[PDB]
Design a binder for this molecule. Structure first.
Ligand SMILES: *C(=O)/C=C\C(=O)Nc1ccc(Cl)cc1
Ligand code: NA
Ligand code: NA
Length: 350
């Protein structure tokens, strides 16, 4: 029998995607030689299987390249040789994904998986298809897009402490729509830590911190006044700051406007993209636990703000209840858990 050669690419093929390696397989014989070069003549790294039957590229192929593959198979029946040439995808534009939380992090039970692209994604389904999420213990989750660039993945209920989460964004060589291809792959892994749920009840004006179901701190607080109230709902804890200059102009509100502001505060924990924080407020200690006086932040004492800074972590949960405000928008950026599960589960890839 004359040896046969089978490649994972077709001679004369265009638009070949570089999201997979290129392989060469020999039948009725073994591979005596296999080389692959690009248009400039530079060789492509590869490896031959010990049995001599399979050859595969070992480095990723580039966009907008013409590769020439030459292979020779030898067998008792005879010899066979083939030359193939193919052209890879020619992207119109490239987009880089950014994944949160960070690799190796320990996050709270409310932390979703976040994949943010630096460009608008026309084929959301293709993006979701290219993201493999592993969970241990395994749990059902789903994708949901906060905007044209960022997609979130979370389960129906808060994570179970101790869950391992692994995120592989394999967007390289993937057509994300309108000629937009992924600039690279990204791969992160994180773990869920203690259950920490702080509840701010406007009827009592107390921020109570519960760690694994036990109350460990009770903080008098002053929330947003009626004209600028704090929205009810579930907030995901974000970044921590020993101190931060609060500037309303970052939210489209001129500083010189009635609701504008610009001041420096200590021990600030972010809980919404819309600008809600837990922070030190020495000027309202007298009102904390009695009346609301802020632009929407949870004003707490300096010692309680610092305690919150030291003992709360990204992904922990703050829930506000019984305020005169509405509900935090589900697409705020840290309000994911305000979207009903059935809506989140059905997604919005269009
Ligand atoms: C919290 O109130 C939301 C944004 C912010 O920074 N507000 C704020 C805090 C303190 C002062 Cl004096 C003005 C506005
Ligand atoms: Na190359
Ligand atoms: Na700010």
């Amino acid at each position: 029998l004359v040896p046969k050669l089978t490649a994972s690419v077709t001679d004369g093929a265009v638009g070949v995607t570089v999201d997979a390696p290129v392989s060469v397989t020999a039948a009725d014989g073994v591979l005596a030689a296999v080389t692959m070069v690009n248009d400039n003549g530079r060789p492509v790294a590869g490896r031959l299987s010990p049995d001599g039957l399979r050859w595969s590229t070992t480095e990723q192929l580039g966009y907008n390249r013409r590769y020439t593959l030459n292979a020779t198979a030898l067998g008792l029946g005879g010899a066979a040789t083939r030359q193939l040439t193919f052209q890879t995808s020619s992207p119109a534009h490239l987009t880089m994904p950014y994944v949160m939380p960070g690799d190796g992090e320990v996050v709270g039970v409310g932390e979703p998986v976040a994949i943010r692209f630096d460009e608008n994604i026309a084929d959301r389904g293709a993006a979701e298809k290219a993201i493999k999420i592993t969970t241990n213990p395994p749990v059902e989750g789903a994708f949901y897009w906060l905007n044209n660039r960022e997609v979130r993945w979370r389960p129906e209920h808060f994570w179970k402490p101790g869950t391992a989460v692994d995120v592989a964004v394999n967007t390289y060589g993937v057509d994300l729509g309108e000629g937009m291809f992924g600039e690279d792959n990204v791969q992160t892994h994180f773990t869920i830590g203690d259950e920490v749920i702080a509840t701010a009840d406007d009827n009592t004006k107390i921020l109570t911190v519960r760690v694994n179901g036990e109350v460990v701190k009770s903080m008098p607080t002053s929330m947003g006044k009626d004209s600028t109230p704090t929205a009810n709902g579930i907030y995901i804890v974000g970044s921590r700051y020993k101190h931060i200059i609060m500037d309303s102009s970052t939210y489209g509100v001129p500083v010189n406007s009635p609701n504008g502001y610009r001041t420096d505060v200590d021990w600030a924990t972010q809980i919404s993209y819309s600008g809600v924080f837990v922070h030190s407020a020495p000027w309202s200690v007298g009102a904390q636990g009695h009346t609301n006086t802020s632009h929407g932040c949870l004003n707490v004492s300096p010692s309680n703000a610092q305690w919150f800074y030291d003992h709360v972590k990204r992904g922990d949960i703050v829930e506000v209840v019984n305020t005169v405000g509405g509900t935090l928008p589900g697409i705020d950026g840290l309000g994911d858990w305000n979207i009903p599960w059935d809506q989140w589960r059905a997604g919005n890839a269009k």
